[PDB]
Design a protein around this ligand. Structure first.
Ligand SMILES: Nc1ncnc2c1ncn2[C@@H]1O[C@H](COP(=O)(O)OP(=O)(O)OP(=O)(O)O)[C@@H](O)[C@H]1O
Ligand SMILES: Nc1ncnc2c1ncn2[C@@H]1O[C@H](COP(=O)(O)OP(=O)(O)OP(=O)(O)O)[C@@H](O)[C@H]1O
Ligand SMILES: Nc1ncnc2c1ncn2[C@@H]1O[C@H](COP(=O)(O)OP(=O)(O)O)[C@@H](O)[C@H]1O
Ligand SMILES: [Mg+2]
Ligand SMILES: [Mg+2]
Ligand SMILES: [Mg+2]
Lengths: 234, 313, 70, 308
């Protein structure tokens, strides 16, 4: 049974005591606001051993910007651990997975193959997708004036994700970018009908996080700072 | 390495049809004959032939160092100003000369048109000049004074070299021959200047001996009304990469004269010149400030204009 | 000056007119990427069109010797 | 992409034509379709379709790699390249990193080209590894490189050896530089044991010179080209382990007096780190991080181009 969202992050989901069944969340904000820092915070919580405050559940990470900094992750894990050593961090990393996707078609091919991963790793109960909006500009040109043609591949990936999230009760933390102009939707409808919570990031170092929950149309606000130890919720 | 069709210069409409049929990388289209590729997609045989042509179709620092020495610098008869520039106005690079009107930019432009024709055996470059005049300041009779004066100066050295080959290059160097290699171009509006700049890469390929291109006036004296929309697409893109590439493939020097700047036209303009000089007054005495350069630190010098032409103080 | 006098194909001229382009001046103000969109031509093909259009307005060359001799 | 003979064993025209007739053209449709409706109906062997689908899916998809295994490779292959300028090296925390896209910002004559030449000379002489300098504005000057080399050593053989280790290329339009980058990628792919080359650094002088013309009007063809260039640089960096360096202009947002890059919101997400250069004197340039994944921003300091 997947752990409830209120356990993954008590400082964001303080009213989600029920076990999760295929929820989806999204991050949105300008550059250098902390979207990738949060994914390190959540990733650290889920791979650390239970003796050190973690949950001990594997994680899968999908990258399409090539911005994943291995050193920045490891420096966090050594800090958080009470007594960090090389032979300890090895096991902490042993529950982390990574893939790179170069184009929407490559991503779609990867998704159809990821069906085999979860059939072999039942503990894999988290899924992260960085910069879902990487191929927007390229694809919007190859599709011509016909909107249906512009979004064809992005729609298929959306239909694939929803199928994976429910067959195995995962949590998807997608990430997007502020490319046009608070909020300005540009992705397809086949995807925007899936997101439950949409969270926004701002800059002033103090970072302010605003959460909107379309499940109940409730708005909140949080604060946090980024230090050498990672994210700290005020 | 799976080149992607968005990186190729294929026409936008044809690319849409190609991708819709399922083609993603250029490596797929290499084997298919043009006859079949015209049927799988809704394009004509001519397009099928043009497309497959695009799909299929250097020097180290040591080598560039050798070429840099050999390619002579253009002198200005001002040993002071020529000293800060490193020897003279260089080839394969763009230069700019800013300054308020009435300071002598056109005099320096004219003096360079003559100094590019000096024979090589005196340390010159032996090239012809192109003078794209936008302000209509060209005065041929002035070149005569700058020309005959230079020959007299050139004559005063050959007598000390005695029987060297200078006595033949001096015969080759004459007033009529000098004036028979200065090409004029009168532009009266932005459209004419754009048209001329578009055709210049052709005019230069026909005359391999040209070694200096001058653009007397990058900003028209009366940019007004709707013309301001025409100025864009010339300072943008046009006069930043057309002049650099033209001045490099043909191995020549380009000089742009500017009038707006007057102190020590678009924010991105400042990056459009490899070198930039500024002329201004001080106590009613001319100055030649160097403001930007990737090989010479900022410095200032003095100069004066005499009937004999550009000269030191 | 109007484009149809320059020497462009009649068919193409209509494709331009449907975008509210009538004079050579309007034609020159567009960048190469725009002209590709509004013509269907490849990158090199647009340069040939630009050369053709400019060849009807560029100034006439004049040697310095000639002007001195009037 | 589109199906073709030889893309994998077991494919022929007499079957590819059947698939094409049945509205199955590319690999995506083949793997996203229903095989039984195509096998029992329309007369195709179910086992053959399954085998073909699995082979294609395996061949044209990513394969997840554990974190522990990747950590060793990263720690062993990653390296830090000194930039020569001692102070700026401290600001960057030992300098450039292999596998990331670095960017430099600054107005006219703020030392963007001088810093690039300094890194090129230092990498050519100290570490003695090759360098590719993609020049888009004629900034490169052979004499300045020789001068900066002389500032380090006086031997004439060492200088001659160093100057032959720097390749120079020219690209004054978006397509030429894309061709150059793809050619470099192909050369590195083919040459697996040619250590005589093995470019370890890339310097793209004024990446804003070949992108600013493409942007303009209501068209969107320029954005796709810029993003294609960004993907090219990203793959060059990450996949091949070459410390790419880029140079960009600056501008002031109309709403406030702050400085920012010039290529817009889409570009700002590309670089993995940014260094802003500004003037407070011929030299005495001031540097301060504006973007990084390992240090706080806004750490202002001083450098002097008069010596470097
Ligand atoms: N170790 C650290 N100590 C202090 N501040 C840090 C540290 N690492 C990163 N930061 C700061 O925290 C922020 C990091 O943001 P992050 O890496 O999450 O970017 P992002 O939102 O993914 O950006 P983008 O999408 O534009 O690439 C930046 O302000 C960076 O300066
Ligand atoms: N030999 C030198 N000694 C000292 N300073 C020098 C030297 N050569 C150049 N400079 C300085 O370098 C400055 C030019 O900087 P640089 O060539 O790096 O500009 P840039 O960033 O490429 O500019 P642009 O935006 O126009 O491309 C000159 O103004 C001068 O101050
Ligand atoms: N034959 C000459 N002898 C001395 N001075 C001259 C001669 N011809 C022009 N000048 C000086 O040059 C100045 C004009 O410079 P000009 O060519 O207009 O510069 P710019 O082109 O930058 O405006 C005048 O003030 C004039 O005094
Ligand atoms: Mg990020
Ligand atoms: Mg004048
Ligand atoms: Mg430069």
């Amino acid at each position: 049974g997947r752990s409830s969202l209120k356990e993954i992050e008590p400082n964001l989901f303080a009213d989600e005591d029920s076990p999760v069944h295929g929820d989806i969340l999204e991050f949105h904000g300008p550059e250098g606001t902390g979207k990738t820092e949060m994914l390190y915070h959540l990733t650290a919580r889920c791979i650390l051993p239970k003796s050190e405050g973690g949950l001990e559940v594997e994680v899968l990470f999908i990258d399409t910007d090539y911005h994943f900094d291995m050193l920045r992750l490891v420096t966090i894990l050594e800090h958080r651990l009470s007594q960090s050593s090389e032979e300890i961090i090895k096991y902490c990393l042993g529950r982390f997975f990574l893939v790179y996707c170069s184009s929407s078609t490559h991503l779609l091919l990867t998704l159809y193959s990821l069906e085999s991963m979860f059939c072999s790793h039942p503990s894999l109960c988290l899924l992260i997708l960085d910069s879902l909006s990487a191929f927007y500009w390229i694809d919007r040109v190859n599709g011509g004036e016909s909107v249906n043609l512009q979004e064809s591949t992005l729609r298929k990936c959306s239909q694939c994700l929803e199928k994976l999230v429910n067959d195995y009760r995962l949590v998807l933390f997608a990430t997007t970018q502020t490319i046009m102009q608070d909020y300005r939707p540009y992705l397809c409808k086949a995807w925007q009908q899936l997101v439950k919570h949409r969270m926004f990031f701002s800059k002033q170092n103090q970072f302010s996080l605003v959460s909107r929950c379309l499940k109940s149309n409730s708005l909140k606000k949080h604060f946090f700072i980024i230090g050498e130890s990672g994210v700290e919720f005020c | 390495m799976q080149r992607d069709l968005v990186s190729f210069p294929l026409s936008p409409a044809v690319r849409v049809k190609l991708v819709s049929a399922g083609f993603q990388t250029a490596e797929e289209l290499l084997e298919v004959k043009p006859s079949e590729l015209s049927k799988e997609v809704g394009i004509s045989k001519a397009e099928a032939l043009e497309t497959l042509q695009i799909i299929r179709r250097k020097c180290t620092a040591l080598e560039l160092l050798e070429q840099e020495h050999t390619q002579g610098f253009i002198i200005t008869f001002c040993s002071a100003l020529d000293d800060i520039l490193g020897g003279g106005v260089p080839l394969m690079k763009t230069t700019e000369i800013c300054g308020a009107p009435g300071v002598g930019k056109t005099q320096l432009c004219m003096q360079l048109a003559v100094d590019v024709q000096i024979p090589e055996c005196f340390g010159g470059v032996a090239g012809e000049a192109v003078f794209i005049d936008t302000e209509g300041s060209f005065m041929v009779d002035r070149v005569v004074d700058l020309a005959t004066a230079c020959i007299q100066h050139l004559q005063l050295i050959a007598e000390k070299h005695k029987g060297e080959e200078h006595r033949k290059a001096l015969e080759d160097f004459t007033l009529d021959n000098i004036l028979s290699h200065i090409y004029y171009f009168r532009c009266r509006d932005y459209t004419e200047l754009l048209a001329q700049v578009y055709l210049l890469p052709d005019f230069l390929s026909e005359h391999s001996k040209v070694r200096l291109v001058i653009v007397d006036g990058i900003a028209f004296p009366f940019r007004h009304d709707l013309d301001d929309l025409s100025l864009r697409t010339r300072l943008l893109n046009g006069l930043a990469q057309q002049m650099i590439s033209l001045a490099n493939n043909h191995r020549l020097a380009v000089i742009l004269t500017n009038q707006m700047t007057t102190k020590i036209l678009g924010e991105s303009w400042g990056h459009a010149a490899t070198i930039r000089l500024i002329f201004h007054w001080d106590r009613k005495q001319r100055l030649a400030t160097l403001y930007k350069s990737p090989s010479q630190k900022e410095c200032t010098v003095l100069f004066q204009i005499k009937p004999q032409g550009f000269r030191d103080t | 000056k109007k484009l149809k006098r320059v020497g462009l194909s009649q068919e193409l001229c209509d494709r331009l007119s449907r975008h509210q382009i009538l004079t050579c001046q309007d034609f020159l103000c567009l960048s190469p990427l725009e002209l590709m969109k509004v013509t269907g031509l490849s990158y090199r093909g647009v340069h040939e069109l630009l050369c053709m259009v400019s060849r009807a307005c560029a100034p006439k060359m004049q040697t310095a010797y000639g002007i001195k001799a009037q | 992409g589109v199906l073709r003979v030889g893309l994998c064993p077991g494919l022929t025209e007499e079957m590819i034509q059947l698939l094409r007739s049945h509205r199955i053209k590319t690999v995506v449709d083949l793997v996203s379709a229903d095989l039984e409706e195509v096998a029992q109906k329309c007369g195709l062997s179910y086992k053959a379709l399954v085998a073909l689908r699995r082979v294609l899916l395996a061949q044209f998809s990513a394969f997840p790699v554990n974190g522990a295994d990747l950590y060793e490779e990263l720690k062993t292959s990653t390296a830090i390249l000194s930039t020569g300028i001692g102070s700026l090296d401290k600001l960057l925390d030992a300098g450039l990193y292999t596998g990331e896209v670095t960017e430099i910002v600054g107005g006219p004559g703020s030392g963007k080209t001088q810093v690039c030449l300094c890194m090129a000379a230092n990498v050519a002489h100290g570490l003695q590894q090759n360098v590719l300098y993609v020049d888009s504005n004629g900034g490169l000057t052979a004499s300045r490189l020789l001068q900066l080399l002389q500032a380090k050593t006086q031997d004439e053989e060492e200088q001659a050896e160093a100057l032959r280790r720097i390749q120079v290329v020219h690209a004054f339009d978006i397509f030429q530089m894309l061709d150059v980058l793809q050619e470099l990628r192909g050369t590195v792919a083919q040459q697996v044991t040619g250590s005589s080359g093995t470019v370890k650094v890339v310097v793209v002088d004024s990446v804003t010179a070949v992108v600013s013309p493409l942007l303009g009007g209501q068209q969107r063809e320029g954005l796709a080209l810029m993003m294609q260039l960004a993907r090219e640089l990203k793959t060059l960096a990450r996949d091949l382990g070459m410390a790419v360096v880029v140079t960009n202009h600056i501008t002031r947002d109309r709403d406030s007096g702050r400085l920012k890059p010039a290529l817009g919101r889409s570009w700002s997400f590309v670089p993995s780190t940014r260094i802003l250069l500004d003037t407070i004197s011929g030299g005495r340039r001031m540097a301060c991080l504006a973007k990084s994944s390992r240090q706080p921003t806004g750490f202002q300091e001083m450098v002097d181009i008069g010596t470097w």
